[PDB]
Design a protein around this ligand. Structure first.
Ligand code: NZI
Ligand code: MG
Ligand code: MG
Ligand code: MN
Ligand code: MN
Length: 532
DNA sequence: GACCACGGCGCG
DNA sequence: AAAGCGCGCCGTGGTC
């Protein structure tokens, strides 16, 4: 039954706020409230009232801190019950669910939100009493990380807009040429973007063999894997693949990115969602800057668009074979430890076995292999017979015997405890491990043993970001992007070299393992340059 | 306009 | 597509 108390609130109050739209960098601050000591404070003018707070503590703290940074204010995020709930159970991803689950309702009014924040925090902090590992992750990783992300989000990254505009006009001309071919070959026009219309053309009119069907609705699939299986079975398939690539990059990146430049900053701002994934990874959205193309020649042209402020350079740091090293440490496989203790590369060894484009393939291969891929799909990818695909799966695990033993212990443990955990104790609940439908059970198993490996690499990286960020600010350098095992920094030209050495070392020393973490670093005027 | 399910595909 | 995992956004297609 909170009481209206005059703004401002006492120091250390829980904040509620309402935004015109989810994106902090783009939102209007509609309302701002705070709660403390059995009272609620509703600010008369939200923007002015921001100045009174000294830290944002409450649901979605980082977002409001991001909006504060955009206004020239340094209001860092503090406690956020979402981070508590997320650590308790990573399926806790939204305030709607968290409130439903731990004792309130997520409404649209800042006061009730500030109130909700306060009681949700009490209750969750209660639930976390005694979970000392999760408390450690909260204090040493997540809560400090929120500040770092708020700064990355507010900073943004520079984009060569004029370049992409020109690229759009070029690519559009290429697409029209391929559309025309496809339409001719099909003997009539139709919407090449409609997978439904395409399917009737390929499998009914052209009478091509229907490899596979789609998951939910059982239509005949027109996916790249299926089209690749028909690249020589007919010429029109080939062009379809190329129309898909261009339209995919044009409509997802080339055309939308330029129109998202912020007016005040002149830069492009993503959101780094901190309670979004089941393994502990971050995600990026609005726009997603974690899937900017890079694997093909055209995508590379897109990456070139991401450039440094004049007088600065981008610094790109990227852990080598990160999840493999984690697997060595997690499992104890001596043969795999040695692989890394003596500077061996097995992403390059799976390339010649099966340059920069051939190494990306061995990356899809050795990772697909490792996480329970099927002999069937491996045979199909590598273009070899099923007989040969099983032997790359026999040897790939013969070499490193303790991995399978680790997989088993992990699954056995997740069955008893109902969850699996990373090196630091981050939990993921995986209930279907005792499912009586084999398929459902074995999916769960693949989810279960991947988590500690992907989630440990994410713990390490978050920790590296937490340690590295203070050093960058004191050097006048900036942290721009994180792509799971990678960081892009922006540095004044004359500090760029020292920043790279420093960041490389911080990341490599984040938390020593039974195997060394190695980092590749590069420096350049654009994101593509910085990774050569 | 808003929403959503689906197939599809980009990156890690 | 199939016994890899984790995401977010696209166009289409359908509703309200
Ligand atoms: O689960 C998959 N499937 C993948 C397919 C292609 C590429 C990576 C894949 N990964 C994950 C594993 C790891 O978390 C991260 C490493 O990211 P990448 O930088 O791409 O690879 P890498 O660390 O093995 O080696 P390298 O840095 O010398 O290139 O990506
Ligand atoms: Mg061209
Ligand atoms: Mg989906
Ligand atoms: Mn990488
Ligand atoms: Mn890497």
């Amino acid at each position: 039954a909170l009481e209206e108390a005059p703004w401002p609130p006492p120091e250390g109050a829980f904040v509620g706020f309402v935004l015109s739209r989810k994106e902090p960098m783009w939102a209007d601050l509609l309302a701002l409230a705070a709660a403390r000591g059995g009272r609620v404070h509703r600010a008369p003018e939200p923007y002015k009232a921001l100045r009174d707070l000294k830290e944002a503590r409450g649901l979605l703290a980082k977002d409001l801190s991001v909006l504060a940074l955009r206004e020239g204010l340094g209001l860092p995020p503090g406690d956020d019950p979402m981070l508590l709930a997320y650590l308790l159970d990573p399926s806790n991803t939204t305030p709607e669910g968290v409130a439903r689950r731990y004792g309130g309702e997520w409404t649209e009014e800042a006061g009730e939100r500030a109130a909700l924040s306060e009681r949700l925090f009490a209750n969750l902090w209660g639930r976390l009493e005694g979970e000392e590992r999760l408390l450690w992750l909260y204090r040493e990783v997540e809560r400090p990380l929120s500040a770092v992300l708020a700064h990355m989000e507010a900073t943004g990254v520079r984009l060569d807009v004029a370049y992409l505009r020109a690229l759009s006009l070029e690519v559009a001309e290429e697409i029209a040429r391929l559309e025309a071919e496809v339409f001719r070959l099909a003997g009539h026009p139709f919407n090449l973007n409609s997978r439904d219309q395409l399917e009737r053309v390929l499998f009914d009119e052209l009478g091509l063999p229907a490899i596979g069907k789609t998951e939910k609705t059982g239509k005949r699939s027109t996916s790249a894997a299926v089209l690749e299986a028909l690249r020589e079975a007919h010429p029109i398939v080939e062009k379809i693949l190329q129309y898909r690539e261009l339209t995919k990059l044009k409509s997802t990146y080339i055309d939308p990115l330029p129109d998202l430049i912020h007016p005040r900053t002149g830069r492009l701002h993503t959101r780094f969602n901190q309670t979004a994934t089941a393994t502990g990874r971050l995600s990026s959205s609005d726009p997603n800057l974690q899937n900017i193309p890079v694997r093909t020649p055209l995508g590379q042209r897109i990456r070139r668009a991401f450039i440094a402020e004049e007088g600065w350079l981008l610094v790109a740091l990227d852990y080598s074979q990160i999840e493999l090293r984690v697997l060595a440490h997690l499992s104890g496989d001596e043969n795999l430890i040695r692989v890394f203790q003596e500077g061996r590369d097995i992403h390059t060894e799976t390339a010649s076995w099966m340059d920069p484009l051939m190494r990306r393939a061995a990356k899809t291969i050795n990772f697909g292999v490792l996480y329970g891929m099927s002999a069937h799909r491996l045979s199909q990818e590598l273009a070899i017979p099923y007989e040969e695909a099983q032997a790359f799966i026999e040897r790939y695990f013969q070499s490193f015997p303790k991995v399978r033993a680790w997989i088993e212990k992990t699954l056995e443990e997740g069955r008893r405890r109902g969850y699996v955990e990373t090196l630091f104790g981050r939990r993921r609940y995986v209930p279907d491990l005792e499912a009586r439908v084999k398929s459902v059970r074995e999916a769960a198993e693949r989810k279960a043993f991947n988590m500690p490996v992907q989630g440990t690499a994410a713990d390490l990286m978050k920790l590296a970001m937490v340690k590295l960020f203070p050093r960058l600010e004191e050097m006048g350098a900036r942290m721009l992007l994180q792509v799971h095992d990678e960081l892009v920094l922006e540095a004044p030209k004359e500090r760029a070299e020292a920043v790279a050495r420093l960041a490389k070392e911080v990341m490599e020393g984040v938390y020593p393992l039974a195997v060394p973490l190695e980092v590749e670093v590069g420096i350049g005027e654009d994101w593509l340059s910085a990774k050569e």
